């Protein structure tokens, strides 16, 4: 695809998400979701492989269905209230209606079934965009309408998100599928705290943003998509595998690494809201993410997997990429715990 | 600058530079058949860039000073050693072939990179599409285990699929009794002991496989030894094609911009060569691989990125 | 009997077995949208009505 065409396509996708976050009218919220969808498919089609076509088809069907289902939540709220303003809506069925409509876009509940497969089919760069930027728009609506949500319904959706998202992660070879399962698990953590206090729902977002940019662009720099392919990268560039294991540990949430900051604050909030069983179970399931995190770390840098004699050419040459913002990404994604009280800036 | 997306946007295209002297002609044939001699004559008489046959140290030639690095540091295989014991247990045979395939695959990219950045055609010996004739030959007498074929193919589809085929292929047809004639005059004791079967088994795989299936996507002209020496005859024959079949007479600036992206990135072009399927001949254990990498790293120039090695004389390191 | 058989089976191995036994069946999906969308239809149906989420 022509770079100028590619730049515009990304530009609309960014604006579509930007449109959602800046619209006080329910119709415009839908406009941003659809036109963001309208330009997401071609980016997944950049490689144009039969796997990508299967991935893009899967992604479009679920996203279009969720967006179309979103309209009734607007229409039903319209019907019972005559208000297009995006605020605390006035119908439990409509409130229920959109909550799964937005959840399918995020992929938390069994709705999450599209998240892994689409990432597998499409390229690493496209997966980075899909799992990081395309999660701001659905979250933006939930933050604004958080006051109207049924607590039981949303907490459940968050629970199965971390529950299933972490559980299946133990059985993934392809790194792309590992990342998506991690994404679903991280999806639950932010969504769980969403009804209680939206401030650290955002705090989880930018932090979870940081590793996924850090991990994916590290993976792109590695040019590896499988666990075995990642393992060979120790021979070429051992240093990169070293930073990845820092982020792998950090994204797992071990203190004092950055990834512990969200989970710690999340547990603190619902503990203030008298919900104390709910935080405990998610923390227990947090180790599930850490396991295949360790397995990748064991394969990447902690041990030293066998290499291939054909790796010798890679030594002679050098990388031509510029990996923009990678230096500041991992540093901001591994040691920011001392700067935790800065979360009041989000408020 | 390079062909980065800013360059293409600001106006850097590819169809403007290329002209009728933009071809991927490959002069090729059997062992010692004088193909390299004919390839040079085509290069001189057409103003067309030449590429000598990619050896074990062809990659070494591209990087650094071009001085052939140590076989331990680059290749873990010797053609002369393969001559002595073709069925050696160390896997010198397949390691030779796979490294050779990578070297010519790098050579193919270097030809395309220069061609697309200059518009001048490229002539090279034994394009990667013809590399299978040796592995087929090394498989018939069991010089390599059967599994080497699938891995060599597995690399071939995951790499050679994107690299599109040449324009016209020059073949120096040479019969085996003739091949058995010159190699005595060569003199190097390692190449005397080449089996007549090996010279046979390359020939038919060259004849019944390489030429016909690949002919449907580029012109093929067969020359024996006499029509090989006739540089005047072959060169006007090369000029006298329309070159319709093959992907080359169909693409636009869009593909060429993408093609120059992959080729310019020297890590990407051979990225799939280091395929993680494990076989004894090509797999090197962690201890041996790590120690060699330290030995590679401690070499001058390679300690840091190019233009960043103070030992060789990279001044202003604190400012670059 | 205890240190190398039971104490390693009650807490550690049982949880490890349960996780693995239920990691495979979650990840063992078919890739056919017909089943996935059928699962969504159940999810919409049960969530809207059965668990009294609407009321």
């Amino acid at each position: 695809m022509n770079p100028i065409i590619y730049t515009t396509l990304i530009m609309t996708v960014m604006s579509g998400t930007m449109l959602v976050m800046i619209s006080s009218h329910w119709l415009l919220i839908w406009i941003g979701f659809e036109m963001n969808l309208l330009a997401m498919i071609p980016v997944l089609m950049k490689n144009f492989n039969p796997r990508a076509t299967e991935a893009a088809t899967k992604y479009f069907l679920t996203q279009a269905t969720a967006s179309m289902m979103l309209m009734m939540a607007i229409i039903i709220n319209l019907l019972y209230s005559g208000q297009w303003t995006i605020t605390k809506m006035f119908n439990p069925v409509a409130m229920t209606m959109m909550t799964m409509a937005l959840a399918m876009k995020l992929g938390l509940s069994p709705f999450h079934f599209w998240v892994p497969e689409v990432t597998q089919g499409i390229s690493l760069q496209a997966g980075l965009l899909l799992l990081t930027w395309q999660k701001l728009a659905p979250l933006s609506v939930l933050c604004q309408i958080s006051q109207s949500i049924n607590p039981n319904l949303m907490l459940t959706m968050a629970m199965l998100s971390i529950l299933i998202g972490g559980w299946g992660g133990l059985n993934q070879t392809q790194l792309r599928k590992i990342m998506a399962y991690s994404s679903i698990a991280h999806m639950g953590w932010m969504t769980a705290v969403l009804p209680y206090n939206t401030t650290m729902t955002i705090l989880n977002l930018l932090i979870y943003i940081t590793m996924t940019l850090a991990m994916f662009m590290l993976l792109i720099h590695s040019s590896a998509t499988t666990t075995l392919s990642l393992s060979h990268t120790w021979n070429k560039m051992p240093v990169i595998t070293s930073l990845m294991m820092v982020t792998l540990l950090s994204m797992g949430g071990l203190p004092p690494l950055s990834g512990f900051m969200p989970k710690w604050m999340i547990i603190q909030e619902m503990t203030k809201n008298e919900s104390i069983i709910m935080p405990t179970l998610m923390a227990m399931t947090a180790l599930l993410n850490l396991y295949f995190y360790m397995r990748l770390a064991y394969s990447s840098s902690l041990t030293m997997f066998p290499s291939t004699n054909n790796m010798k050419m890679k030594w002679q040459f050098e990388h031509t990429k510029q990996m923009k913002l990678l230096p500041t990404m991992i540093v901001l994604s591994t040691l920011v715990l001392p700067m935790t009280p800065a979360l009041s800036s989000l408020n | 600058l390079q062909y980065g997306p800013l360059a293409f946007v600001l106006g850097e295209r590819t169809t403007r530079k290329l002209t009728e002297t933009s071809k991927v002609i490959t002069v090729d044939g059997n062992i010692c058949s004088g193909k390299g001699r004919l390839a040079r004559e085509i290069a001189e008489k057409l103003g067309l860039r030449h590429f000598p046959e990619a050896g074990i140290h062809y990659a070494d030639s591209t990087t650094g000073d071009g001085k052939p690095l140590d076989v331990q540091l680059s290749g873990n295989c010797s053609l002369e050693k393969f001559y002595d014991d073709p069925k050696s247990n160390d896997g010198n045979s397949y390691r030779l072939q796979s490294w050779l395939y990578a070297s010519r695959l790098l050579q193919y990219a270097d030809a395309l990179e220069h061609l697309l950045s200059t518009g001048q055609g490229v002539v090279l010996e034994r394009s990667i599409y013809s590399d299978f004739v040796f592995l087929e030959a090394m498989y018939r007498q069991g010089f390599i285990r059967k599994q080497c074929v699938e891995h060599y193919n597995e690399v071939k589809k995951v790499t050679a699929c994107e690299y599109l085929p040449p324009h016209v292929v020059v073949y120096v047809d040479v019969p085996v009794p003739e091949i058995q004639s010159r190699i005595q005059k060569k003199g190097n004791p390692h190449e005397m002991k080449i089996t007549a079967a090996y010279l046979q088994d390359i020939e038919n795989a060259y004849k019944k496989t390489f030429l016909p299936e690949m002919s449907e996507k580029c012109e093929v002209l067969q020359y024996s030894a006499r029509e090989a020496e006739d540089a005047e005859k072959v060169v006007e024959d090369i000029e006298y094609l329309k070159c319709d079949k093959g992907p080359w007479p169909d693409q636009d600036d869009r593909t060429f911009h993408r093609l120059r992206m992959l080729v310019q990135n020297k890590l990407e072009v051979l990225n799939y060569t280091t395929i993680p399927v494990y076989l004894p001949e090509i797999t090197i254990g962690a201890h041996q691989s790590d120690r060699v990498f330290q030995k590679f790293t401690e070499l001058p120039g390679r300690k840091y990125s190019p233009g960043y090695n103070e030992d060789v004389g990279d001044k202003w390191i604190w400012l670059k | 009997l205890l240190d190398l058989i039971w104490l390693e089976t009650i807490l550690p191995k049982t949880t490890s077995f349960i996780q693995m036994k239920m990691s495979i069946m979650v990840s063992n999906q078919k890739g056919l949208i017909k089943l996935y969308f059928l699962s969504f239809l159940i999810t919409i149906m049960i969530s809207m009505t059965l668990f009294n989420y609407h009321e």
């Binding site: 059985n171 070879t173 997997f305 | 494990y278 | -």
Partner: peptide, 26 residues
Amino acid sequence: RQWQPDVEWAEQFGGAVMYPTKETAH
């Protein structure tokens, strides 16, 4: 020297799933 992974460890992590079954065998 310290033990390092070999083709046994690598193939343990290689394939479609490190936790395989008859359903995932094919």
